[PDB]
Design an enzyme around this catalytic site. Sequence first.
Site, mmCIF file in Angstrom:
data_model
loop_
_atom_site.group_PDB
_atom_site.id
_atom_site.type_symbol
_atom_site.label_atom_id
_atom_site.label_comp_id
_atom_site.label_asym_id
_atom_site.label_seq_id
_atom_site.Cartn_x
_atom_site.Cartn_y
_atom_site.Cartn_z
ATOM 1 N N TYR A 51 25.052 29.643 17.268
ATOM 2 C CA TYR A 51 25.170 29.452 15.823
ATOM 3 C C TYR A 51 24.080 28.514 15.312
ATOM 4 O O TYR A 51 23.940 27.378 15.784
ATOM 5 C CB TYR A 51 26.551 28.904 15.462
ATOM 6 C CG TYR A 51 27.723 29.751 15.948
ATOM 7 C CD1 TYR A 51 27.603 31.123 16.117
ATOM 8 C CD2 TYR A 51 28.959 29.172 16.210
ATOM 9 C CE1 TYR A 51 28.683 31.901 16.562
ATOM 10 C CE2 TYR A 51 30.046 29.938 16.648
ATOM 11 C CZ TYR A 51 29.906 31.286 16.825
ATOM 12 O OH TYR A 51 30.992 32.021 17.275
ATOM 13 N N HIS A 116 30.631 33.979 25.731
ATOM 14 C CA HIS A 116 30.419 34.472 24.371
ATOM 15 C C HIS A 116 29.941 35.925 24.382
ATOM 16 O O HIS A 116 28.829 36.213 24.853
ATOM 17 C CB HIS A 116 29.396 33.577 23.666
ATOM 18 C CG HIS A 116 29.301 33.787 22.185
ATOM 19 N ND1 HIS A 116 28.530 32.982 21.371
ATOM 20 C CD2 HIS A 116 29.900 34.684 21.365
ATOM 21 C CE1 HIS A 116 28.629 33.396 20.120
ATOM 22 N NE2 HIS A 116 29.462 34.420 20.088
#
Length: 308
Positions: A51, A116
């Site tokens: 992110y 992830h």
Amino acid sequence: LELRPLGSTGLKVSCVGFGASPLGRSEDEAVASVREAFRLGINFFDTSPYYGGTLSEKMLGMALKASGVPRDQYVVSTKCGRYKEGFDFSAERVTRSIDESLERLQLDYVDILQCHDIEFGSLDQIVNETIPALLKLKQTGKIRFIGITGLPLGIFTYVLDRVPPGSVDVVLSYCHFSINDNTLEDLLPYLKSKGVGIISASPLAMGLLTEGGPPEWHPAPPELKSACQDAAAFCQKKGKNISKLAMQYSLTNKDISSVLVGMNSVKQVGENVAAAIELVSAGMDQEMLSEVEAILKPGKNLTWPSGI
């Protein structure tokens, strides 16, 4: 704000979770929004080195440190394996990754470290290399619980069927528990049979369930985009915010311990917590929910490809 038990971890997380991805896109704003999160009962914060190309972890780390809240009264999730440079689920990389994350977050440990978007990796590498590496990290104390995340629900049965029992503590699903798609319901009995905690995300299906509509990059098929556009415009003429309805719907199954929502302002924090409290003290607009579900029927449970 209701706290829900997270699987067999013994943790209790707020049913609204603070998704810190927008904090990677100022510092005063990140501090204020995290402060208000704590004020209103949120105790769960999720991020990833992906992110903002690591800026989200840095901003969350600074906002948590400015909060003054004891570290054992909240729960921090970050991820490994997905980076701005791409994917790497190797034991070497995830072992280095927790030290990189902990430095950016200014933390001594994360409660949860999650692989992830594993559908972009070899699932057999995840089972035989990646998860055994995180188990060794758990012995160092730098993490306390292990998760896996991704879009296709089949990644979770694939992995959890094949690891030694107890290897994976938590699952992070997204886009499968919203008014348009509630198939995460199917997975709950499987996960509960194992004692695995369940977290969901994207209660608005990445912007489909909004008056403004989905972003230009959205992967949904035209049939789902058309149904959601029709639902949002139906609400708009009735003076109702489809996003509040969708967020409330996302909270109606207490087997999901938390629904993460991306937040980057005090306003967004307050709006989402207020939806949750309203759901508990007044219930949900059942007539509105019914109309929206009828309109969304042509797009019900439609998904899209993800991974390799």
